[PDB]
Amino acid sequence: VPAFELYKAAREEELCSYRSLCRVLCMHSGGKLTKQQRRILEDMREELCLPTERAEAELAAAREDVLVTSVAASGVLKRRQDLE
């Protein structure tokens, strides 16, 4: 594999991993993030070398995603004993 393909596969995973991080932390917090959750996002931004404009974009997107908000609304994640 040429280096540019490897970078591309890795870059896209970096950004996917951040995306799924925003959605999921918003599913739990209903978008209003704990200090730990903020620190996880902040640390991964630096780990993954993410421009904050893109990073704020993913967080903004996850906050308003319909699945994300429905899961926060349903409260199922607070009820794991019923569903597991």
Question: What CA–CA distance (Å, rounded) separates 56 from 33?
Answer: 13
Please state, in angstroms and rounded to a whole number, the distance separating the CA atoms of residues 83 and 5: 41
The identity of residue 21, as a single letter, is L
Terminal C-alpha separation, the chain: 42
- Tell me the resolution in Å: 2.3
Q: How many CB atoms lie within 10 A of CB 18?
A: 20
SS3 call for 5: helix
Measured over the CA atoms of residue 39, residue 66, residue 71 and residue 30, the dihedral's sign is positive
Cα-based distances in Å from 16 to 33, 34, 51: 20, 22, 14
Range of the domain at 72: 1-84
- In the DSSP assignment, the letter for residue 79 is -
How many domains does the structure of the chain reveal? 1
Instruction: Please give the DSSP secondary-structure letter assigned to residue 76.
Output: G
Helix (H, G, I), strand (E, B) or coil at 6: helix
CB 16 within 8 A of CB 58: no
